[PDB]
Amino acid sequence: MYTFVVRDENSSVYAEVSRLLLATGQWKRLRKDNPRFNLMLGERNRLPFGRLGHEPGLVQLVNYYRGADKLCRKASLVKLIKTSPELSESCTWFPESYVIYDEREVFLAAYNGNVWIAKSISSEASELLDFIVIQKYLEKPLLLEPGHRKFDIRSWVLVDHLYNIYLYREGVLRTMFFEEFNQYLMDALNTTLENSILLQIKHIIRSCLMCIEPAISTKHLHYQSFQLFGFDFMVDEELKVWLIEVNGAPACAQKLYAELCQGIVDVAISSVFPLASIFIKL
Amino acid sequence: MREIVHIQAGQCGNQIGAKFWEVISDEHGIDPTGSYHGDSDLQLERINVYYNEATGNKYVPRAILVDLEPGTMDSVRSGPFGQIFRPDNFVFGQSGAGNNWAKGHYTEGAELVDSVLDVVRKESESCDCLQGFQLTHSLGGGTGSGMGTLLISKIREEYPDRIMNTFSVMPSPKVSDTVVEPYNATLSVHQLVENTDETYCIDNEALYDICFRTLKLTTPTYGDLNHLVSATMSGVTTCLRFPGQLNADLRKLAVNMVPFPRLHFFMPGFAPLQYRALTVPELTQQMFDSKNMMAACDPRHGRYLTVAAIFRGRMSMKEVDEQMLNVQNKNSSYFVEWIPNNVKTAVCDIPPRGLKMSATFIGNSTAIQELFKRISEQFTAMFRRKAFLHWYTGEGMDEMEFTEAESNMNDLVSEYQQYQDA
Amino acid sequence: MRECISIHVGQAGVQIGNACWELYCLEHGIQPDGQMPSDKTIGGGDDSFNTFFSETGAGKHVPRAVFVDLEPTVIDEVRTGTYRQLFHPEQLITGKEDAANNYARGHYTIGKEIIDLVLDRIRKLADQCTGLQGFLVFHSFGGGTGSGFTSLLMERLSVDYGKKSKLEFSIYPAPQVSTAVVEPYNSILTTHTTLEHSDCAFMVDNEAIYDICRRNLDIERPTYTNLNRLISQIVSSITASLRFDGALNVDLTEFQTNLVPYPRIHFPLATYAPVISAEKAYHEQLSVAEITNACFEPANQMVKCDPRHGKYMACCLLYRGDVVPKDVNAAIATIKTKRSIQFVDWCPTGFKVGINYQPPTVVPGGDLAKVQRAVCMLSNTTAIAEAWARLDHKFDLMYAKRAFVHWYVGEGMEEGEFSEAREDMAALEKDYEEVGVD
Amino acid sequence: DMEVIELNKCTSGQSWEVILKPPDPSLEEIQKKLEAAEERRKYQEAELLKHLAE
Ligand SMILES: Nc1nc2c(ncn2[C@@H]2O[C@H](COP(=O)(O)OP(=O)(O)OP(=O)(O)O)[C@@H](O)[C@H]2O)c(=O)[nH]1
Ligand SMILES: Nc1nc2c(ncn2[C@@H]2O[C@H](COP(=O)(O)OP(=O)(O)O)[C@@H](O)[C@H]2O)c(=O)[nH]1
Ligand SMILES: CCOc1ccc(C2=Nn3c(nnc3-c3ccccc3OC)SC2)cc1
Numbered sequence A: 001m002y003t004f005v006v007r008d009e010n011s012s013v014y015a016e017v018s019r020l021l022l023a024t025g026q027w028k029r030l031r032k033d034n035p036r037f038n039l040m041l042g043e044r045n046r047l048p049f050g051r052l053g054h055e056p057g058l059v060q061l062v063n064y065y066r067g068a069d070k071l072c073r074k075a076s077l078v079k080l081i082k083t084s085p086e087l088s089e090s091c092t093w094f095p096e097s098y099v100i101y102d103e104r105e106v107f108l109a110a111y112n113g114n115v116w117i118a119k120s121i122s123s124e125a126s127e128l129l130d131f132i133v134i135q136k137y138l139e140k141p142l143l144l145e146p147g148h149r150k151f152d153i154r155s156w157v158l159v160d161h162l163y164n165i166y167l168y169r170e171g172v173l174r175t176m177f178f179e180e181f182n183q184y185l186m187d188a189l190n191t192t193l194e195n196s197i198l199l200q201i202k203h204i205i206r207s208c209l210m211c212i213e214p215a216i217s218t219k220h221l222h223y224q225s226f227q228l229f230g231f232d233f234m235v236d237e238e239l240k241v242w243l244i245e246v247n248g249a250p251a252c253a254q255k256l257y258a259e260l261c262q263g264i265v266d267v268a269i270s271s272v273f274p275l276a277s278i279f280i281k282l
Numbered sequence B: 001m002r003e004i005v006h007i008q009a010g011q012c013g014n015q016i017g018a019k020f021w022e023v024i025s026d027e028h029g030i031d032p033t034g035s036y037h038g039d040s041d042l043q044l045e046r047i048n049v050y051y052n053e054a055t056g057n058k059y060v061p062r063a064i065l066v067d068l069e070p071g072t073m074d075s076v077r078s079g080p081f082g083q084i085f086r087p088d089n090f091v092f093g094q095s096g097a098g099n100n101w102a103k104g105h106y107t108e109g110a111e112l113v114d115s116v117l118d119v120v121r122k123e124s125e126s127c128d129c130l131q132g133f134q135l136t137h138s139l140g141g142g143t144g145s146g147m148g149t150l151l152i153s154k155i156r157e158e159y160p161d162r163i164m165n166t167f168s169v170m171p172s173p174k175v176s177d178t179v180v181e182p183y184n185a186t187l188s189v190h191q192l193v194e195n196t197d198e199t200y201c202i203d204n205e206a207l208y209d210i211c212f213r214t215l216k217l218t219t220p221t222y223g224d225l226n227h228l229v230s231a232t233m234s235g236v237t238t239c240l241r242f243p244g245q246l247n248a249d250l251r252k253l254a255v256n257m258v259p260f261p262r263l264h265f266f267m268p269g270f271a272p273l274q275y276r277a278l279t280v281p282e283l284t285q286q287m288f289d290s291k292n293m294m295a296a297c298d299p300r301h302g303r304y305l306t307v308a309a310i311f312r313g314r315m316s317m318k319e320v321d322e323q324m325l326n327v328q329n330k331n332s333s334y335f336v337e338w339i340p341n342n343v344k345t346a347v348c349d350i351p352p353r354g355l356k357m358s359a360t361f362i363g364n365s366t367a368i369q370e371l372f373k374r375i376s377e378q379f380t381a382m383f384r385r386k387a388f389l390h391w392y393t394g395e396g397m398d399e400m401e402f403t404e405a406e407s408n409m410n411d412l413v414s415e416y417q418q419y420q421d422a
Numbered sequence C: 001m002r003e004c005i006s007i008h009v010g011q012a013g014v015q016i017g018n019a020c021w022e023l024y025c026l027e028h029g030i031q032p033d034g035q036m037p038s039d040k041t042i043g044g045g046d047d048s049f050n051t052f053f054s055e056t057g058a059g060k061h062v063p064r065a066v067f068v069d070l071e072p073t074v075i076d077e078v079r080t081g082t083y084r085q086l087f088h089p090e091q092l093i094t095g096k097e098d099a100a101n102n103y104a105r106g107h108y109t110i111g112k113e114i115i116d117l118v119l120d121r122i123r124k125l126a127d128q129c130t131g132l133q134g135f136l137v138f139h140s141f142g143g144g145t146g147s148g149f150t151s152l153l154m155e156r157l158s159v160d161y162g163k164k165s166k167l168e169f170s171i172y173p174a175p176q177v178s179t180a181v182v183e184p185y186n187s188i189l190t191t192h193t194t195l196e197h198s199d200c201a202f203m204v205d206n207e208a209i210y211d212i213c214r215r216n217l218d219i220e221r222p223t224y225t226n227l228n229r230l231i232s233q234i235v236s237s238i239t240a241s242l243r244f245d246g247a248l249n250v251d252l253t254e255f256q257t258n259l260v261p262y263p264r265i266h267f268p269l270a271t272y273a274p275v276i277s278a279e280k281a282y283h284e285q286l287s288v289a290e291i292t293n294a295c296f297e298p299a300n301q302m303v304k305c306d307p308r309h310g311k312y313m314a315c316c317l318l319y320r321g322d323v324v325p326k327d328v329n330a331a332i333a334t335i336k337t338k339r340s341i342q343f344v345d346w347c348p349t350g351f352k353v354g355i356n357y358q359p360p361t362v363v364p365g366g367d368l369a370k371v372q373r374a375v376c377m378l379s380n381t382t383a384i385a386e387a388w389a390r391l392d393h394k395f396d397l398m399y400a401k402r403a404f405v406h407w408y409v410g411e412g413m414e415e416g417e418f419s420e421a422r423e424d425m426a427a428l429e430k431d432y433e434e435v436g437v438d
Numbered sequence D: 001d002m003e004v005i006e007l008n009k010c011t012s013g014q015s016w017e018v019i020l021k022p023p024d025p026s027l028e029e030i031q032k033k034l035e036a037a038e039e040r041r042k043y044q045e046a047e048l049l050k051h052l053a054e
């Protein structure tokens, strides 16, 4: 009989995870301030990672990685890539970005197709600076037919306590799932989703986590950690995958809630707390 | 040197007090004559806590026998370990209490209350460091209940910086002698709240259910009920009598087990209650079981403020720590979350007689309110018709004093309910 | 030569002191009766070991330490112990009844009675010093004596010895090895009081040592002996520079200069390596780079925390044994390219290194194996605030319900001191956040 | 590029510094605290002895 607490009511994903734990008959939900627990579904802002793994005879597990905010923030992601030797400036799959509060003089040098976009879209530099990071807007994206429309790809990644990178087989396209999207490529561009896009996707995901691995790894800590991430990609007309942003607490597709949340319990929860694959390992 | 002055008052208090001294004398290897015949030096390392060393290297129990009638104390002296007690410590009257708290606390009792303190003071002057006072009595009587609380009030006046500890025995309709027992109990509790630091609620109803349902005794006698108490008192004062890695000095017990100056009523528990040796997880499960509670209160109906457990005998200390932490994690809904690590456990290497290993339970549970509620229901039931009050009013008491005791106890219950919903 | 006086308050302070002074006598080759064959200058001398030892005409090397406890039961074991001929009878101070896990009882009630006696006994050893540096206080956050009396003692020492520095060796309370539940109460109170009197305090979490003695020494239930013998190794490595010839941390002043940039922030995170079991027959002797890299492992720290998410301000490396400067610097370069070592922008990213040629001495028959080389890292990390966060949270749980408060008010202390001590801790955690957190 | 500065060597050992990257209440006040707490103990005990006398 394992125990777990809930400290995030706004969580849409772990609302199903906590529901399945009570359906096993081997997991008991306790109060949100009860220190005697095995699993923790903490909040997003200011999570007390300090009070974890300090209870005698209790192997504690948290659904977040301390220090993963360097990858899930706008300004941090740009800084992380440019300052890491394993990523550096010469990064093929990451668009030209600049941090503006800085890299103001550096931005104007590369400015002199010239359209950018700021976030935390206009061809003129002056307007953008006056509004306020500034990323190079992909002026030539891949367009689906019929419709001549723009889209993006969401991939859910689960990393357990042993830091094993697992990629969900079922992705979504916020223009469409993989099975429908794969058929379109084979009929229009004469290629598969596995080779053209998914290969670059498995590269971006693996490279980012291995870069920040020795900074957030919980191999020799007093508490283990796991976290479900949400990568957002972009594909141009040359079939090249670009990295946009990484979400710390992402959402999931409606029909995929049953399958994905079950997988989280199996390889990220039951792997630590055994009871009485839908993931592609990288 | 941390010496404790033991006091037993009344019929009940003396009979269970005598059984207490029987067991610990066996544990410390003291024959009925008062000489030492043990085998280990651990039995004499902290022997000065309860025993006074005599002239011929004997050990005379630092205990005072008090009663208003010689009927009970003469039975103790004519008992198996009656020649071990100091002859001067036998202070008794002749009139009696007659199961009357009024006679014991105001009239007849006050005529002898000074005679006892003269023995109390004499036992205190020989103490290198007076630890506290240990009282053993019942609350359904007159001598132990009336004069007992009077001694407490008198001692506290003389010794304001000494710890007050009592082993109060609770009356019950099942095991009763009179009908005025709830009257005496209510009047005693009010005194125990304001003038004591520690109190072990020992319900005779719980002692009866244990003998009847668990021990399978078709007809339990007082002697059987005393065995449960005698073994319980042996477990509670284990660390006090035997050298431990915790260094118990009674005062620490008060600071740790009592979070609020009015909530200091504990629930004793013992396990096992046979040749087949029990294992560590078996002792732990029984120790928190409701069938081993000696206060007739269901732990699941309340929450534990503080919990102290002691394990005697040779056992895997690692496994003990695991099973204890196991209960807290499997039953976290019955432990308050505003007191971190409110469950401590120590291990004694010397087991009692008859058992290779045992476990004694002490818990300040808020479920003890049911004990005071049961008395309050029996009290008001009679007091609303002013029944049997002429036995008290004829001793100089008024109805106003009873009403104050009823209110003071009901307010105590409200406090236990207050922190139960925290 | 400048002498130093050690102070051991409470059961924790005394027993730990026993493990240290035992280890001290083994490193300097001092027999339990006080005799030292190595010391050729009988009766006098101003060597490196005279800072912690005084000499008589008989050739006895009397330690410059004072043991104080409200109960005799602990120090009486020292009076009849192996080193009974080592200490002078006036150095062992004992009272009647203890503080009973109560800060107020040990600071106000009983502490007032015996404070004048202790200071007089400390004055006895202070007059035997040509140039006293300061004091080393050994106590615990949990005990009523180690917290109550210590706080009062540290106040008087700042009055009678204002120009003297005072270092602490406090013991952080852990649930695995605890004696009371009001220890978070005692911990906060003694911290608030001694904060303005301590120049540098080294915290040692019992939970860490307990888990180190289980992981490395393969001991199921480690005793105080196993704990103290391990803590003594850390203290010995820190005070090695004081007891032996050196250039780094030669006095109690450099400890504050090289580790304490901000007065309030004087809690360095200590890390020791390696911890080897004696029962092990075949072991691989770890190299210089291997034990240095182990300093950035949470499983070898005195306080369990994650320095990766905290910023450093100053770091010191203390090596003992077969260690050469070439291998040390070679290790530091490698660590920077693997570990997340982040220093504050207002401090030089560097390391102060000290090397002692004499290998770490171990107690014969103990549980620690003899090593050829070791290292004790002293890093002032802002991630050590996690220790305060945990402790203050347990403080807020009980104080919100006003539990166990009357035991402190009944000893003369006011309820206002709780809030005062808590608002001070809330300001302390704010300081750490303004330095490390971006 | 690291720099070793202040290298001092002695029979007991040697020491240096490697750089990687450039950047009270008086006695009277205490006695008042103690005597104020002692007096409150006497007060709380006086109220106890008074209550018992009543
Ligand atoms: N490392 C170590 N910690 C100890 C030792 N003894 C006690 N402690 C810790 O200190 C805490 C309180 O014990 P002490 O500080 O020794 O209490 P005390 O000094 O006897 O003072 P009193 O409160 O009056 O009993 C406990 O929770 C332990 O965790 C020891 O010998 N070694
Ligand atoms: N457990 C136990 N309870 C007793 C014993 N003798 C009396 N009692 C309880 O004490 C109450 C009777 O009061 P009693 O002690 O005889 O009056 P007193 O001694 O003169 O004050 C009854 O409710 C009994 O439950 C005994 O030997 N064992
Ligand atoms: C929950 C709060 O934390 C505590 C800390 C310390 C104690 C002490 N135990 N103690 C004493 N006298 N009898 C006992 C005792 C009684 C029954 C069982 C086990 C015992 O402990 C060996 S003195 C202090 C108790 C609780």
Ligand SMILES: [Ca+2]
Pocket: B095, B111
């Ligand atoms: Ca008469």
Ligand SMILES: [Ca+2]
Pocket: C039, C040, C041, C042, C043, C044, C045, C046, C047, C050, C055
């Ligand atoms: Ca000399």
Ligand SMILES: [Mg+2]
Pocket: B011, B141, B177
């Ligand atoms: Mg009777």
Ligand SMILES: [Mg+2]
Pocket: C011, C071, C074, C098
């Ligand atoms: Mg002590």
